[PDB]
Structure formats: C-alpha cells, structure tokens
Design a protein around this ligand. Structure first.
Ligand code: NDP
Ligand code: 63Y
Length: 186
C-alpha cells in the first residue's frame, strides 16, 4: 500500500456540505479532477482505495456509486453490511487502514484517499505520519452546515507545484477556484 491522502473542496468559510449536497452548484471540472486524482494509480495492476463516511456515500448520485475503478469503503458503526454498491464496510478509521494491510488487499491497493466528511478528515489530519491534503479552494463564501477541520500551517506545507495539478485559477459557472496540495510528515 502506498500514500495516504485526503481530498476535499472547501469554500472560503471552511464549508464542505449543506443539506447533504455541496454548498455550491455542481462544478464539472472539479468533479472530473476529483475522479482523476482518486482513480489514478502510479503502479501497475493496483487500485486506489477511497474511504468515506456514511453520509458522504449517500450524497453521491446513485448513478456514480460506487466510484468506478476504485475500491469503495464506507465507515459506519450502525450499518451491519456495505451499502448496495459499496465494497467494504469498516467501523473505524484504524480498521479501514489495518484492513488495507491484509493479504487480500495489501498487494492490491496503491493510494488510499479519504474523501470525506468532517470527522474522517479531522482524525486523519491529526494523526502522526506522512499525509498529503489535496484541497480545492472555492474562492467565495457559501452557506454551509458541514466544515473542513483547521489546517495547521506549522505542520502542513503548501507545495509550490505538484505533477498532474493545475496552479492557476479556474472558473466554472462564475465561480473561481484553485487546486492546492499540502504535505506533512510527523
Ligand atoms: N466538499 C467536499 O469535498 C465534500 C463534501 N461532502 C459533503 O459534506 C457532507 C457529508 O459530511 P459529514 O456529515 O461530515 O458526514 P460523513 O460522511 O463523515 O458521515 C458521517 C457518518 O459516517 C459514519 N462515520 C464517520 N466517521 C466514521 C468513523 N471514523 N468510523 C466509523 N463511522 C464513521 C457515522 O455513521 P454511523 O452513525 O452509521 O456510525 C457518521 O454518522 C455532506 O453534505 C456531503 O455532501 C462530503 C465529502 C467531501
Ligand atoms: C466528496 C467530494 C465531492 S461529492 C461527489 C464526489 C464524487 C461524485 F461522483 C459525486 F457525484 C459527488 F457529488 S466533490 C469533491 C469531493 C471531494 N472529496 N474532493 C473534491 N475535490 N471534490
């Protein structure tokens, strides 16, 4: 198993969700970027694992579930089996990560991507180790009910560039946004 990474899109006021959807109208090229970065392996014959919470799973349009070409694992302590379409179910972040180190998965998984929501991100971000955050900055305020945890800039360094990631400002439907990558190692 290779890298651990978080990926999120976040408004200026730290917003990630509202009423079970995103705070902003759909940005196709943002979703396209998410799909590309999560799906692309850097190895041959291995797949990336995506780890998400239960509400994140059900916020994905059913036609896009499971996220194709990735191993989809959902976190929940209430569910007793993976949701229709999902692959694995785990009861904690330690267990999903322990689970990747099984003979079954260990030589099948390249990257592991945590794709939301707030509690999964907070635990990973505050756990010692090598972790990168792929953060799309949505360059305005949007009314939100679910937020991204604080990024401690003393530990996470914004990288000045990264392969396969545009640095420049983008715009779709009158909303400007920008792709960033952060890295810690502690
Ligand atoms: N802008 C973006 O990049 C993103 C946006 N979103 C949006 O954000 C909001 C969804 O986020 P949020 O409410 O934070 O929900 P989550 O996706 O984190 O789901 C929360 C549920 O997941 C289960 N859960 C979460 N963490 C764990 C864990 N570590 N171990 C076991 N179970 C866990 C619990 O379910 P149970 O109670 O069954 O134990 C909890 O009630 C939605 O609006 C969504 O559309 C989601 C991802 C990214
Ligand atoms: C979690 C998420 C988004 S929600 C979402 C993802 C995939 C999909 F096919 C959908 F239909 C959908 F609504 S969009 C997004 C993210 C994350 N975690 N990161 C980024 N950059 N973008």
């Amino acid at each position: 198993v290779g890298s651990l990474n978080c990926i999120v899109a976040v408004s200026q006021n730290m917003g990630i969700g509202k009423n079970g959807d995103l705070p902003w109208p759909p940005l196709r090229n943002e979703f396209r970027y998410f799909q590309r970065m999560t799906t692309t392996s850097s190895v041959e014959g291995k797949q990336n694992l995506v780890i998400m919470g239960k509400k994140t799973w059900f916020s994905i349009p059913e036609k896009n579930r499971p996220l194709k070409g990735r191993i989809n694992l959902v976190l929940s302590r209430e569910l007793k089996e993976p949701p229709q379409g999902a692959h694995f179910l785990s009861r904690s972040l330690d267990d999903a990560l322990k689970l990747t180190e099984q003979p079954e998965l260990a030589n099948k998984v390249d990257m592991v991507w945590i794709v939301g929501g707030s509690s999964v991100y907070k635990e990973a971000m505050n756990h010692p180790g090598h972790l990168k955050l792929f953060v799309t900055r949505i360059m305005q305020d949007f009314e939100s009910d679910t937020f991204f945890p604080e990024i401690d800039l003393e530990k996470y360094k914004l990288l000045p560039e990264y392969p396969g990631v545009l640095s420049d400002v983008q715009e779709e439907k009158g909303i400007k946004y920008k792709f960033e990558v952060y890295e810690k190692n502690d």
